[PDB]
Structures are given as C-alpha cells and as structure tokens.
Amino acid sequence: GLVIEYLMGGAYRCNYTRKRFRTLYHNLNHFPFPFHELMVWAVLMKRQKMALFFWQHGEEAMAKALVACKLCKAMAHEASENDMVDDISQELNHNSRDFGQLAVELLDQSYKQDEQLAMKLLTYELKNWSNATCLQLAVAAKHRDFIAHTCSQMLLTDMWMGRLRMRKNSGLKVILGILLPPSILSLEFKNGRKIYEFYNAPIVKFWFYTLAYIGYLMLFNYIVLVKMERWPSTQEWIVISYIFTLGIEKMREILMSEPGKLLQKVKVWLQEYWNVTDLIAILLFSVGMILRLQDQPFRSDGRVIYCVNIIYWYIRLLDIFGVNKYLGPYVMMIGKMMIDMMYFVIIMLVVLMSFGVARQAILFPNEEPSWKLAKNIFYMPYWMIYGEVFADQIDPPCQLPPCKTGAWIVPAIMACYLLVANILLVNLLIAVFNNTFFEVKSISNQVWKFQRYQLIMTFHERPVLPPPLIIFSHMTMIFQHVCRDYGLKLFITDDELKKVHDFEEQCIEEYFREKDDRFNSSNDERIRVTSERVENMSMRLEEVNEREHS
Amino acid sequence: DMMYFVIIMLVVLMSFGVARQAILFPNEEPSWKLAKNIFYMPYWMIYGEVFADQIDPPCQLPPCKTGAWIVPAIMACYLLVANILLVNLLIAVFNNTFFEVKSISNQVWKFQRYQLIMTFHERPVLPPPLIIFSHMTMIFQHVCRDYGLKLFITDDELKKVHDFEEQCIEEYFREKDDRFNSSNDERIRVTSERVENMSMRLEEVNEREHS
Ligand SMILES: CCCCCCCC(=O)OC[C@H](COP(=O)(O)O[C@@H]1[C@H](O)[C@H](O)[C@@H](OP(=O)(O)O)[C@H](OP(=O)(O)O)[C@H]1O)OC(=O)CCCCCCC
Ligand SMILES: COCC(CCO[C@H]1CC[C@@]2(C)C(=CC[C@H]3[C@@H]4C[C@@H]5O[C@]6(CC[C@@H](C)CO6)[C@@H](C)[C@@H]5[C@@]4(C)CC[C@@H]32)C1)COC
Numbered sequence: 001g002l003v004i005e006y007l008m009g010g011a012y013r014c015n016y017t018r019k020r021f022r023t024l025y026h027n028l029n030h031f032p033f034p035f036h037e038l039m040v041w042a043v044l045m046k047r048q049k050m051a052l053f054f055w056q057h058g059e060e061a062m063a064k065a066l067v068a069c070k071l072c073k074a075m076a077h078e079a080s081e082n083d084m085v086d087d088i089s090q091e092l093n094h095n096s097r098d099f100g101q102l103a104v105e106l107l108d109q110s111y112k113q114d115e116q117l118a119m120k121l122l123t124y125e126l127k128n129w130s131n132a133t134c135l136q137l138a139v140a141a142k143h144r145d146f147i148a149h150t151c152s153q154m155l156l157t158d159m160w161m162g163r164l165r166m167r168k169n170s171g172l173k174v175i176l177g178i179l180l181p182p183s184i185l186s187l188e189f190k191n192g193r194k195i196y197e198f199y200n201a202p203i204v205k206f207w208f209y210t211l212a213y214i215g216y217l218m219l220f221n222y223i224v225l226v227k228m229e230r231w232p233s234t235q236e237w238i239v240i241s242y243i244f245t246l247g248i249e250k251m252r253e254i255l256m257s258e259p260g261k262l263l264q265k266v267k268v269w270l271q272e273y274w275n276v277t278d279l280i281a282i283l284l285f286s287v288g289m290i291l292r293l294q295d296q297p298f299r300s301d302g303r304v305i306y307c308v309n310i311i312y313w314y315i316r317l318l319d320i321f322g323v324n325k326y327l328g329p330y331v332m333m334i335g336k337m338m339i340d341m342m343y344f345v346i347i348m349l350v351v352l353m354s355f356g357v358a359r360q361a362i363l364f365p366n367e368e369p370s371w372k373l374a375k376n377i378f379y380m381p382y383w384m385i386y387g388e389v390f391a392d393q394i395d396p397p398c399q400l401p402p403c404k405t406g407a408w409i410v411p412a413i414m415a416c417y418l419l420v421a422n423i424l425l426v427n428l429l430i431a432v433f434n435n436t437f438f439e440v441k442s443i444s445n446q447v448w449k450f451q452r453y454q455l456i457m458t459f460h461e462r463p464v465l466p467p468p469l470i471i472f473s474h475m476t477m478i479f480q481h482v483c484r485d486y487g488l489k490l491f492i493t494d495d496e497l498k499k500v501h502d503f504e505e506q507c508i509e510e511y512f513r514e515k516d517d518r519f520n521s522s523n524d525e526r527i528r529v530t531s532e533r534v535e536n537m538s539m540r541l542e543e544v545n546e547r548e549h550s
Numbered sequence: 551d552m553m554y555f556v557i558i559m560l561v562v563l564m565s566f567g568v569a570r571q572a573i574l575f576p577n578e579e580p581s582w583k584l585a586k587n588i589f590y591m592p593y594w595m596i597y598g599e600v601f602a603d604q605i606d607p608p609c610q611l612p613p614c615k616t617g618a619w620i621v622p623a624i625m626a627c628y629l630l631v632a633n634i635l636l637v638n639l640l641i642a643v644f645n646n647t648f649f650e651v652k653s654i655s656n657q658v659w660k661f662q663r664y665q666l667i668m669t670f671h672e673r674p675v676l677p678p679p680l681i682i683f684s685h686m687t688m689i690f691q692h693v694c695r696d697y698g699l700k701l702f703i704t705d706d707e708l709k710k711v712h713d714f715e716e717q718c719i720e721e722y723f724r725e726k727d728d729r730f731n732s733s734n735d736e737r738i739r740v741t742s743e744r745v746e747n748m749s750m751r752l753e754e755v756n757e758r759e760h761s
C-alpha cells in the first residue's frame with residue numbers, strides 16, 4: 001500500500017493503509033473485488049499477460065486501465081532513475097502505452113454506444129480508487145489522447161458552461177449579464193438562487209476576470225502615457241491595488257497547493273512559466289513603485305520601470321486569448337517556432353558582426369577606444385536588413401574630403417551581406433517553417449485540448465470576484481477560517497452504480513467481440529488459414545491416392 | 551486566416567508603441583494624439599519605413615531622456631517578432647491549407663455557375679443606365695420557358711428517354727455487381743469458405759472407408 005501511494009501521486013491513498021484494513025490486518029478475510037487486487041499484483045510484478053487477463057474480468061475496467069498506465073509509467077521512471085539495464089524501462093513504457101491504448105479504445109466504444117452513460121462513466125466517484133474520477137486518473141497519468149477524445153471534450157464543455165443551457169451563441173450573453181444585472185433572470189437554467197447559480201459558472205468568472213484585466217490595462221496605459229505628478233492619482237492607485245491584490249492571490253494559491261511542505265509547494269507552483277514570469281513582473285513593479293515615490297531622478301527611473309513593465313502585461317493577453325479554439329494552437333505554434341528560429345538568429349548574428357566590424361574598421365581608422373565602437377557594429381548592419389539600406393550613410397561619397405584607403409570594398413561587402421541575409425537565410429527559414437508545420441499543428445491541437453481541463457479546473461476553484469476587488473473574498477475566507485457536488489465528481493446511488501457497471505461490462509464485451517471479428521476476417525488471416533488447410537488437404541488426398549485396393 | 555493573425559500582430563504593435571511613446575515623451579498633457587502615436591509609426595515601420603533619428607532620436611545637443619537607450623533594444627525584438635516569425639508562420643499556414651481551399655473553391659464556383667446563368671437569363675436586355683425603358687415596358691404589360699429552364703418533349707421522346715434511363719440503371723447495377731464479385735477480398739473469402747467445406751468433405755470421405 002505504501003509503495004502504491006508512492007507510485008501514484010501525492011493525493012492517492014490506497015485501501016491497505018486505511019485504518020480499517022490496518023486494524024483487520026493487525027489481528028491476523030476476503031476481498032469484495034478480487035480482480036482489483038490481482039490486477040495490481042500482476043502490474044507490480046511486471047507480468048503483462050497476467051495483467052491483461054485480469055483486466056477484462058471484473059468491474060471498473062477503465063479505472064483499472066488508467067491506474068495500470070500510471071503505475072507502469074511510475075515504475076519505468078523509477079527504474080530509469082536507478083540506472084537499471086534500460087530494457088526494463090522500455091518494457092514498462094510499452095506496458096504503459098498498451099494500457100493507455102486499452103483505456104482509449106474502451107472509451108471510444110462506450111461513447112459510440114451511449115453518450116450520457118459514457119459521460120456518467122467518467123465523472124462518478126471511485127470508492128475503491130481513492131475517490132478520484134476517471135478524468136483525474138487520466139490527467140494524473142498525462143494521457144493526452146484520453147482528454148482529447150470527443151466525449152471528454154463534451155464533458156469539459158458541460159463543466160465549463162456551468163448551470164446554463166445556452167449553446168448556440170454564448171459569450172455575448174454572459175457579457176450582457178455581467179454588465180447588466182437585470183438580465184440574469186432571462187436565461188434558461190439546467191435543473192434569488194438563480195443569481196448564485198449564474199455567478200458561480202466558470203465561464204462567468206472567466207469573463208469577469210477578462211473585463212477586469214482589460215480595465216486594468218486601460219488604466220496602466222493612461223498612467224504611463226500622461227504626465228505623472230509627485231503623488232499617485234486615482235488611476236495609479238487602482239493599478240497599484242490591482243497589482244497588490246494579484247500578489248495576495250498568488251500567495252494564497254501557493255499556500256493552498258497540493259503538497260504539505262512549504263518548500264515542496266513552491267517547487268510545484270514554479271513549474272508553469274507564466275507563474276514565474278508573473279512573480280518577476282510583480283517584483284519589478286514593486287521596485288519601480290518604490291523608486292517612483294522619491295525625488296526627480298528616482299521618479300524618472302521608476303517611470304521607466306513602469307514603461308518597461310507595461311510590455312509584459314500587454315503580452316499576457318495571449319493567455320486570455322488561449323481560451324479561444326483557434327487562437328490557442330497558434331500561440332503554441334509560435335512558441336515552438338521561436339525555438340526553431342533561434343539557430344538562424346545565431347547564424348545571422350555571426351554574418352552581421354562579420355560585416356559590421358570590417359565596415360567600421362575600414363571607414364574609421366582614427367578612433368580612440370570608446371564604447372561607441374561596440375554600438376556601430378550592431379546598429380546599422382541590423383537596421384539595413386529591414387528596409388534602411390540607405391547609401392551615403394554606408395559607402396559615403398569621398399571639394400569632397402579625401403577617400404579612405406581601400407574604402408571601395410564596403411559596397412562589395414554589402415552586396416554579399418544582403419544576398420546572404422535576405423535571399424539565403426530567410427528563405428531557408430521559410431522552408432524550415434513550412435516543412436515542420438503539420439507535426440507542430442497536430443501536437444499543439446492535442447496539447448491545447450489537454451490543457452482545457454486545467455483551465456476549467458483553475459476557473460472552478462477561483463473566487464467569484466475579479467482581482468481588483470478580490471480583497472473582499474479574501475476577508476470572507478478569514479471569517480470562514482475560524483468557522484464538490486459537481487465540477488469534479490458526480491455522486492450516484494447503488495442502483496445507478498450497478499447500471500453503470502452493467503453498461504461498462506456490455507461495452508467491454510462488445511469491444512472484444514468486435515476486435516476478434518475484425519481479426520478473423522482480415523485478408524492475412526484468411527490467406528494463412530487457407531494455406532494451412534490446403535496443405536493438410538493435399539497431404540490427406542495424397543494419402544488417399546496412395547492407399548488403393550484396386 | 552489573416553484576420554486571425556492580425557490580432558497577435560496588433561498586440562505586439564501596441565506593446566511596442568505604448569512603451570516607446572511613454573519612454574520618449576514624459577511631459578505630455580492628455581490629448582487624443584497620444585492614441586495616434588501608438589499605432590501610426592509602429593505600423594508604418596513594419597512595411598519598410600524604418601527611420602532612425604525619427605525613432606531613437608539623437609540626444610548643442612538636447613539632453614537625453616532617462617532610459618532612452620531601451621527603445622532601439624525594443625525595436626530589434628519587435629522587428630524580429632513581426633517580420634521573421636509571424637509573417638513566416640502565416641506563409642506556412644497559407645501554404646499547408648491551400649489544396650483543400652482550392653478544391654472547395656473550384657466546386658463552389660462550378661455550382662454557382664448555375665445561379666449566374668439563371669440570373670442573367672431572367673434579367674432584362676437593357677443595361678442599368680438605360681434599363682428604365684424596359685421597366686416602363688413592364689408597366690404596359692402589367693395591364694395586358696421554351697428553353698433556358700426546361701425542355702418540353704412529346705410522348706414518344708418521353709418513352710425513349712425512359713427506356714434509355716432504364717437501360718443505364720440496369721447497366722450500372724450489373725457493372726457494380728461485376729466489380730464487386732471480381733475483387734480480391736471477395737475472391738479470397740469465397741476461396742477460404744470453399745476450401746473449408748472441401749476439407750470437411752474430404753475428411754468425411756477419408757473417415758468413411760470399407761477396405
Ligand atoms: C477582447 C477580448 C479578449 C478575449 C478574447 C476572446 C475570448 C474568446 O475567444 O472566447 C472564445 C469565444 C468564441 O466562441 P463562442 O463561445 O462565441 O461560440 C463558438 C462559435 O459559435 C463557433 O462557431 C463554434 O464552432 P467552431 O469553433 O467554429 O468550431 C463553437 O462551438 P464549439 O465547438 O466550441 O462547441 C462555439 O463555442 O468567445 C468569443 O470570442 C466571442 C466574442 C464575444 C465577445 C466579443 C467582444 C470581446
Ligand atoms: C486635443 O485636446 C484633447 C482634449 C480632450 C482631452 O481629454 C483626454 C481624456 C483621456 C483620454 C480620453 C484622452 C487622450 C488619451 C486617451 C488614451 C488613449 C488610450 O488608448 C487607449 C488606447 C487603446 C487601449 C487598448 C489602451 O488605451 C485608452 C485606455 C486610452 C485612452 C483612450 C484613455 C483615454 C485618454 C483625451 C480636448 O477636449 C478639451
């Protein structure tokens with residue numbers, strides 16, 4: 001039980017380590033689900049045929065497949081970390097892939113048979129598997145091909161829409177409800193309290209946060225564009241309050257993380273790059289504000305830090321855009337193409353420096369050592385490949401001052417430099433982007449459809465008020481400090497549980513039967529069976545012909 | 551597709567423009583020209599109007615603004631993102647989604663040829679500048695399709711057309727059945743079944759002997 005809790009994750013709790021089983025085992029019965037135990041035994045002992053045999057017998061087949069995939073992945077990682085023979089790691093990874101494919105195929109069959117029962121199969125609480133739905137197990141196993149399935153996407157859409165029924169033209173109606181409160185009681189709701197049901201939907205929280213962020217960006221632009229006085233104005237105080245409350249919210253999110261150790265929670269929070277960049281930006285804004293409330297030079301330095309910091313908050317609109325179906329994969333494709341582009345940037349930088357050093361050395365042979373020498377190399381050779389290729393700034397005409405010795409090579413060097421930079425490297429980069437686009441596009445689609453779950457969960461967990469006035473919700477949590485019906489799970493009775501179990505057994509039997517029928521009717525199997533039967537028939541007929549009494 | 555990419559381009563452009571205008575001009579009263587300097591020159595810069603000393607001005611010499619060296623450093627990154635990354639990704643997007651768009655456009659144009667022909671069959675004979683004469687003619691005919699849509703035929707021609715259609719549909723079904731029967735999959739399936747039955751029969755014959 002301890003090793004299963006170690007392999008699965010932080011929150012998992014096996015049945016062996018429960019107090020009831022510990023008390024039963026201290027003074028030493030049977031198991032209600034024997035194949036649940038035997039499947040885990042066969043998985044932990046690295047017996048794939050036995051595990052595949054035990055998987056198809058019993059209830060909760062999809063949960064067993066997902067748990068087996070996670071266990072095999074964890075065992076492979078542990079074996080690789082302990083410098084094994086490296087064949088054990090490959091075998092365990094193949095076992096994990098096989099179990100993942102089994103889970104995906106079972107989900108496909110279940111969704112193809114019935115839709116509502118399939119969506120009920122992915123959300124009911126699993127008593128025997130540490131109270132975690134199939135979605136949580138599939139996410140913990142990083143199974144991208146499971147969350148990207150159509151049924152999982154429909155389930156995520158239903159969880160995202162909250163308790164509202166509108167599906168044709170949404171978004172605008174949510175904005176109308178947020179901006180005009182006397183329009184909430186005009187929408188259809190799934191089966192006084194209507195306001196609470198409206199404002200707790202993830203989509204309404206998302207649009208509230210979006211509008212607050214747009215207003216904050218507007219105020220930031222206003223305070224940086226116009227002249228700043230000795231003390232902050234009202235808009236500047238609103239911007240400062242937004243930054244401060246966002247920092248408080250980040251601290252609260254860190255404090256309420258999954259692990260139990262303070263330093264362990266920080267490490268798991270500093271995994272997404274957005275969190276690290278947000279921390280850096282908030283710290284830089286605090287430094288700029290500290291410098292801003294001082295005399296004139298420090299005030300100018302703080303204003304310049306504001307002007308630098310506005311760029312990051314403008315860039316962070318792509319995180320808001322990532323909710324859109326078409327603007328998410330494009331942003332991720334951009335992220336991958338930057339890594340593809342860095343190398344050609346390096347090569348072009350080499351060529352640019354090569355031209356610039358020679359031009360500056362030839363045209364200016366009487367220069368004392370000053371740091372402007374390091375600026376003339378990069379400045380104009382970089383600007384000239386973007387449409388500033390002006391002559392007489394390069395290649396000066398030299399009534400006229402005397403021409404420098406050898407100052408005719410410069411037009412010849414900037415005839416090869418432009419040809420290399422604008423005809424060769426950029427066209428090769430275009431070809432590289434062109435021939436590596438299909439794989440990047442497919443990967444981006446899969447990863448975005450996977451991360452939809454994290455988006456929906458983090459907007460289900462978040463408070464209802466946007467960051468500029470979220471301080472009220474934090475004070476409410478203080479009062480509740482001294483004091484999931486849906487969105488994660490879906491609790492059902494025993495009759496519904498039995499119906500779900502029967503549906504799953506029917507689906508898995510149909511899946512195996514259809515797979516066997518497909519295998520038996522393939523051309524290769526028909527050819528093989530026909531060849532064997534023809535060989536046996538030829539032997540028998542030769543025996544008959546040899547055995548004659550006349 | 552281009553309008554989907556223009557939003558990201560506009561985000562980058564606005565970030566650079568706001569940063570530059572805020573760095574260079576810190577003593578500006580609130581006027582609507584502040585909302586114009588953000589879009590104007592950052593937009594013209596990516597179409598070949600990169601003009602140093604109009605951006606990054608040299609500063610007998612007026613004093614340099616605090617942090618004015620940041621502006622060309624932001625310009626380098628802005629130009630690299632706008633003119634090397636997003637435009638090349640847009641080229642790749644246009645390149646990899648061209649075959650389907652081309653085929654769909656061909657089919658849709660060949661479909662809409664019918665609507666073009668019908669709307670020019672229905673229209674009056676005079677062009678719009680002097681179409682008022684034809685409208686006045688319709689007024690006189692208000693108080694008063696041999697071809698182009700249909701083609702009326704007699705009973706013998708109708709029977710001939712019916713017989714031709716019956717012959718065509720019979721030939722279509724016969725050809726489809728002949729194609730199906732001679733496929734490799736059907737031949738393999740029939741051969742396997744006949745081999746199985748023949749093996750059963752020969753085993754029965756061998757098991758049934760009298761000498
Ligand atoms: C400044 C905005 C910054 C945030 C960025 C904008 C935030 C954002 O991008 O949200 C996405 C959402 C768009 O989707 P939206 O809810 O309107 O509706 C989708 C749309 O009808 C598609 O045509 C549907 O099929 P497909 O997709 O063609 O296959 C899709 O069905 P499904 O397949 O999903 O079931 C529908 O979901 O909202 C808007 O952008 C409408 C603008 C309304 C407000 C306009 C004013 C902002
Ligand atoms: C010439 O004389 C003008 C004068 C009127 C002066 O009133 C000023 C009031 C603030 C206002 C409306 C003005 C100029 C900058 C304007 C900013 C530009 C910003 O752009 C936007 C740009 C795009 C947004 C994404 C970001 O912000 C605004 C938040 C911002 C914005 C529209 C806030 C509004 C500002 C005019 C005449 O009347 C007596």
Ligand SMILES: COCC(CCO[C@H]1CC[C@@]2(C)C(=CC[C@H]3[C@@H]4C[C@@H]5O[C@]6(CC[C@@H](C)CO6)[C@@H](C)[C@@H]5[C@@]4(C)CC[C@@H]32)C1)COC
Pocket residue numbers: 369370371372373374
């Ligand atoms: C304005 O007054 C300046 C003065 C300080 C003068 O000291 C000089 C000492 C040499 C030094 C540091 C200076 C200018 C050119 C500098 C070169 C630029 C080159 O670039 C690099 C560019 C990139 C590299 C790949 C190639 O070399 C350097 C080898 C090179 C480099 C950094 C060597 C260092 C040079 C400044 C003030 O102090 C009293």
